[PDB]
């Protein structure tokens, strides 16, 4: 015949199999004077047709040339979806069935999955679609309000959401991440965060945290990796991850009084929030009260905490072998060597080692500990 490849495909496909809503025409007509072959009749008074080799449709009395995709879209049931950039304001949009979402929506995620190249279907009806390309200044304001991100951070977030497909499994009363991409610093950090009650002012963070608490941490993890300077597949410190998390949380009630003494002189401060609950340079809470030394330009500062008003404490240090202080609830261990694996112990009632996705009663654990969590006697 003389039809275009696509058009030939479409026309002779639905020839040896004429669909339900249709009707075989197969006739000649004179539309706007021009000889036109009408192939089929479709709902809405549309006749899929050809003016020789040009392809299209007749509606009312006019012929319009159109791609097989445009026709296929015109005949299809439209699906309505909710588009947003921040998960706070939404607009309903229609997308042709069988068509690719990306065409009309730009880059999009749905339920944590990139669907920029998925083909539309009634299953997506009423689903939320997150857009993130071609963002106006208003959009970026919205994003800064709901995510606390700028544009590069947002793009990083969707990138991580794409790449971080780590299975998460149940281990006793906790969850843990299958090991890959040097993710154990994330694993032990989250094992520690699972003991904590937190709320987050920014909506996307609170929502992600709710999923986290219900055993679905990947979204939240992706937010954290986006907020910080973490690189996929690159090992980092558990304490950094925890710090980013806690910097995002509402810890306004948490304070403590600190005193420093060194050659530079004498300083007294009240630290608030994350600064009140995270401490570096000792693993022992008791040292915070009795005083301990950290390194400084002048050599070494003496550090003393005189007042605590905190929901919990995390004391961290460069990895060291030592007997665990008496009140520790959970701890991170950095086991060096060539690479550098992280594992985690919980102390009560059973002293237990969490390593990837296994749990075993501890027989002997000498170190090297890097983070200790305290919930009582503060
Ligand atoms: Zn000094």
């Amino acid at each position: 015949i003389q039809l275009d490849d696509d058009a030939r495909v479409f026309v002779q496909a639905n020839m040896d199999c004429l669909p339900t809503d249709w009707r075989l025409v197969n006739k000649f007509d004179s539309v706007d004077g021009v000889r036109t072959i009408k192939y089929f009749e479709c709902p809405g008074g549309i006749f899929v047709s050809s003016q020789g080799k040009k392809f299209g449709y007749v509606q009312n009395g006019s012929f319009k040339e159109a791609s097989v995709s445009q026709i296929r879209a015109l005949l299809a049931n439209k699906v309505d979806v909710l588009c947003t950039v921040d998960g706070v304001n939404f607009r309903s949009c229609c997308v042709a069935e069988g068509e690719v979402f990306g065409k009309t929506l730009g880059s999009v995620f749905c339920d944590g999955i990139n669907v920029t190249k998925v083909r539309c279907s009634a299953i997506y009806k009423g689903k939320v679609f997150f857009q993130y390309s071609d963002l106006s200044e208003a959009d970026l304001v919205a994003v800064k309000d709901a995510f606390g991100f700028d544009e590069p951070q947002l793009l990083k977030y969707y990138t991580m959401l794409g790449m971080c497909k780590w299975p998460v499994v149940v281990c006793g009363n906790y969850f843990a991440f299958k090991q890959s991409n040097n993710n154990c610093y994330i694993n032990v950090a989250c094992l520690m965060l699972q003991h904590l009650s937190l709320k987050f002012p920014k909506w996307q963070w609170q929502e992600a945290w709710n999923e986290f608490r219900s055993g679905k941490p990947l979204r939240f993890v992706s937010l954290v990796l986006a907020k910080g300077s973490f690189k996929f597949n690159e090992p980092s410190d558990s304490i950094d991850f925890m710090r980013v998390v806690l910097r995002e949380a509402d810890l306004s009630g948490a304070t403590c009084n600190l005193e420093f003494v060194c050659k530079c002189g004498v300083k007294q401060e009240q630290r608030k929030g994350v600064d009140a609950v995270m401490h570096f340079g000792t693993l022992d809470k008791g040292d915070l009260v009795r005083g301990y030394n950290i390194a400084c330009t002048c050599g070494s500062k003496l550090v003393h905490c005189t007042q605590f008003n905190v929901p919990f404490l995390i004391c961290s240090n460069t990895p060291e072998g030592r007997k665990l202080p008496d009140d520790v609830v959970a701890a991170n261990i950095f086991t060096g060597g060539s690479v550098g694996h992280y594992t985690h112990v919980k102390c009560k009632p059973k002293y237990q080692l969490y390593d990837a996705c296994n749990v075993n009663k501890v027989s002997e654990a000498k170190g090297n500990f890097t983070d200790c969590l305290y919930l009582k006697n503060l």
Side-chain angles (χ1 to χ4, degrees), residues 1-15 17-378:
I1 328 296
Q2 41 195 17
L3 277 195
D4 206 275
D5 276 342
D6 306 280
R8 227 193 59 81
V9 145
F10 193 64
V11 164
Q12 300 218 53
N14 296 303
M15 181 191 67
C17 199
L18 179 69
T20 161
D21 265 20
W22 293 25
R23 181 213 135 193
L24 170 65
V25 178
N26 231 1
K27 282 172 277 177
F28 279 96
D29 199 338
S30 189
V31 176
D32 282 14
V34 212
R35 168 177 155 279
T36 300
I37 298 167
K38 290 180 174 177
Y39 295 105
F40 317 107
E41 183 173 18
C42 318
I46 304 312
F47 292 86
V48 170
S49 300
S50 57
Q51 286 191 332
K53 87 167 184 183
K54 200 158 73 172
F55 181 71
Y57 61 91
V58 191
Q59 73 178 343
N60 315 318
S62 184
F63 175 93
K64 191 71 170 64
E65 169 178 25
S67 78
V68 175
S69 291
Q70 296 176 296
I71 324 276
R72 181 170 44 105
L74 275 204
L75 306 177
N77 301 319
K78 317 280 98 72
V79 185
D80 45 291
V81 300
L82 297 185
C83 290
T84 185
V85 300
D86 62 3
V88 169
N89 294 290
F90 306 77
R91 184 146 73 78
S92 196
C93 291
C94 281
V95 163
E97 189 161 5
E99 204 192 65
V100 282
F101 286 121
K103 185 174 184 172
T104 75
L105 307 176
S107 308
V108 283
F109 270 61
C110 189
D111 306 325
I113 285 164
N114 187 324
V115 298
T116 309
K117 279 79 183 184
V118 168
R119 307 167 197 271
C120 181
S121 157
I123 188 180
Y124 286 117
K125 180 185 177 65
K127 295 301 198 65
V128 178
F129 283 67
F130 274 80
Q131 294 175 304
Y132 63 91
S133 68
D134 288 29
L135 297 188
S136 56
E137 307 91 331
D139 288 338
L140 293 185
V141 164
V143 169
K144 182 72 182 175
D145 292 340
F147 285 95
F149 294 158
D150 52 50
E151 177 158 9
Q153 279 168 326
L154 193 65
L155 307 197
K156 198 191 177 184
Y157 165 69
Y158 287 106
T159 292
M160 299 289 140
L161 211 61
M163 278 160 136
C164 291
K165 306 275 193 35
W166 300 314
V168 177
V169 302
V170 168
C171 284
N173 299 115
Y174 304 88
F175 63 74
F177 287 82
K178 172 203 167 28
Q179 179 164 349
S180 43
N181 307 99
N182 299 301
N183 71 352
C184 34
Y185 78 91
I186 293 169
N187 189 60
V188 309
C190 294
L191 274 166
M192 197 166 273
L193 296 174
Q194 285 173 59
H195 290 265
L196 298 188
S197 286
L198 305 176
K199 309 173 203 170
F200 296 81
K202 295 194 178 288
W203 179 238
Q204 285 300 307
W205 287 73
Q206 182 59 58
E207 180 119 333
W209 175 255
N210 293 340
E211 308 168 42
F212 181 103
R213 285 187 66 228
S214 87
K216 296 192 145 58
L218 290 169
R219 196 179 122 187
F220 184 80
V221 163
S222 303
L223 286 172
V224 169
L225 306 175
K227 185 58 167 176
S229 70
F230 309 97
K231 313 213 161 299
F232 189 82
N233 217 67
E234 170 166 312
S236 330
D237 295 324
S238 190
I239 195 50
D240 285 342
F241 190 96
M242 285 183 292
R243 180 153 208 103
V244 170
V245 171
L246 296 180
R247 272 205 252 268
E248 292 308 286
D250 179 6
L251 295 174
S252 41
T255 67
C256 87
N257 295 344
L258 257 175
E259 298 189 347
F260 304 87
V261 172
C262 74
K263 294 176 165 179
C264 314
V266 170
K267 187 179 186 185
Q268 292 149 28
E269 42 188 16
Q270 170 165 113
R271 292 193 169 189
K272 311 176 174 303
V274 52
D275 301 314
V277 303
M278 303 183 79
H279 301 265
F280 187 89
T282 176
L283 293 175
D284 189 2
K285 173 179 56 147
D287 290 337
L288 290 178
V289 206
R290 290 187 298 274
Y292 66 105
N293 291 101
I294 63 181
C296 178
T297 291
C298 68
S300 72
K301 288 194 269 175
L302 176 75
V303 171
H304 172 33
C305 178
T306 65
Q307 159 94 3
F308 278 113
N309 184 39
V310 295
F312 58 88
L313 296 164
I314 300 176
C315 297
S316 299
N317 204 15
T318 41
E320 65 168 344
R322 67 165 291 167
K323 191 196 166 172
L324 271 194
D326 305 276
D327 287 319
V328 175
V329 167
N332 297 335
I333 296 180
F334 190 77
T335 326
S338 311
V339 267
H341 189 61
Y342 264 107
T343 57
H344 176 91
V345 302
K346 302 187 182 306
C347 301
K348 294 303 300 174
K350 293 280 182 173
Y351 203 1
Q352 311 247 73
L353 183 93
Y354 296 72
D355 173 24
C357 307
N358 289 316
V359 191
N360 293 259
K361 295 174 185 177
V362 167
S363 198
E364 184 180 25
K366 292 173 77 151
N368 290 302
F369 298 104
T370 52
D371 313 292
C372 291
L373 175 62
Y374 297 90
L375 293 181
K376 258 155 276 189
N377 293 331
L378 318 163

